[PDB]
Write an enzyme that holds these catalytic residues in place. Sequence first.
Site, PDB file in Angstrom:
ATOM      1  CG  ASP A 184      -3.689  -0.484 -11.874  1.00 56.48           C
ATOM      2  OD1 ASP A 184      -2.579  -0.258 -12.393  1.00 56.48           O
ATOM      3  OD2 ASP A 184      -4.431   0.398 -11.391  1.00 56.48           O
ATOM      4  CE  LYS A 186      -2.193   2.705 -10.108  1.00 58.64           C
ATOM      5  NZ  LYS A 186      -2.276   3.880 -11.018  1.00 58.64           N
ATOM      6  CG  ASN A 189      -3.602   0.430  -6.870  1.00 55.76           C
ATOM      7  OD1 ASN A 189      -4.057   1.571  -6.791  1.00 55.76           O
ATOM      8  ND2 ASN A 189      -3.503  -0.241  -8.020  1.00 55.76           N
TER       9      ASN A 189
END
Length: 379
Positions: A184, A186, A189
């Site tokens: 994940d 992105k 993040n």
Amino acid sequence: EALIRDPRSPINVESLLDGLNSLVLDLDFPALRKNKNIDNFLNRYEKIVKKIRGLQMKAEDYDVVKVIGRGAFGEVQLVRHKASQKVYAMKLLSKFEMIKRSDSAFFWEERDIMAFANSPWVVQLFYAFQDDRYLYMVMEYMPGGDLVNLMSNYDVPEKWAKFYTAEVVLALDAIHSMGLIHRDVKPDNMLLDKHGHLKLADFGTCMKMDETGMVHCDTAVGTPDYISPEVLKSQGGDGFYGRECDWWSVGVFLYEMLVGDTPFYADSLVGTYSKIMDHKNSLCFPEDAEISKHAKNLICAFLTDREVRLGRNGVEEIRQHPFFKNDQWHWDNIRETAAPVVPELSSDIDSSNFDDIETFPIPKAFVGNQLPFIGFTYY
Ligand SMILES: CNC(=O)c1cccc(Cn2ccc3cc(-c4conc4C)ccc3c2=O)c1
């Protein structure tokens, strides 16, 4: 006796205390208290347990300054610990929501990574604790904000994108060497510290690899704009893929920084999923883009299928890519060089780089809702 002292052990003092505290919580209801065995335990232990509850780290020990992040099951708070006056980011996860939505186990990897990675590329966790409603993770504050905020406030030139892409790669490579795939990646993040350097932060979707370096998974996970075809295709059945899915999401990140929109934007989730499936056709740069041949090349080398994706053979083939030729930093020292945006911070709780932002039913029999969270407390 070594494991009672081992902070990695499931049977250290903190998990034993979690065990006892969870049991009291899950039994102390008058319905269950009609059982004499249950009441014989609770009266003996209630007083000492509530004394222990006050003495162990709890939410009231922190002053909540402002909310700086939200997520599926909770929020991130900027907090000041009253006793020590230290400043932290505290992440809360709702126990009710996590049980209701049968999502009550993603947080172990998140905790262990931030607690133990001991890496300049991973946000460090100092304390994990819980109460009857929430899990808490007390992390180092990242006053720089995230890359969403940065991209909202600058037209990012290719010299800056070179830098953030390199740091994301070293951060992802660091997480790979611990045996994990991020899944994940992105800009939400990717957080920046006091000095403008990147750290990764939301490891909820992370997963440990095989001896083959692979993972079996049947659930498409992560964020719709950034999900790779192999992970998306794995919702059906028997997905088997390796760390190179994180490189797909670096390419989406590169596109977005330089173009201004995600490469597979659509007005429906269903559309985005379909564009990613049809990426060999939907990937299309705008004519007015003005993006270098080298950047377009790297972006396109990431946004391919895994079989021909840059990074499949390791990170060295990423590092030598011509897009990363620069006169500011080397791969060897990039975090010790000057970041493109150094944050001007007015206080230790300056939060200017962040945008502004139900209970369990009383049981009739023993349900054990507190059991999934035993062992979460740390330090
Ligand atoms: C299943 N996952 C969830 O429900 C979930 C719950 C709450 C938040 C999130 C995603 N999110 C968002 C912002 C964020 C900011 C910091 C941060 C570190 O340092 N400073 C700051 C600020 C650290 C972690 C996060 C983070 O995880 C996800």
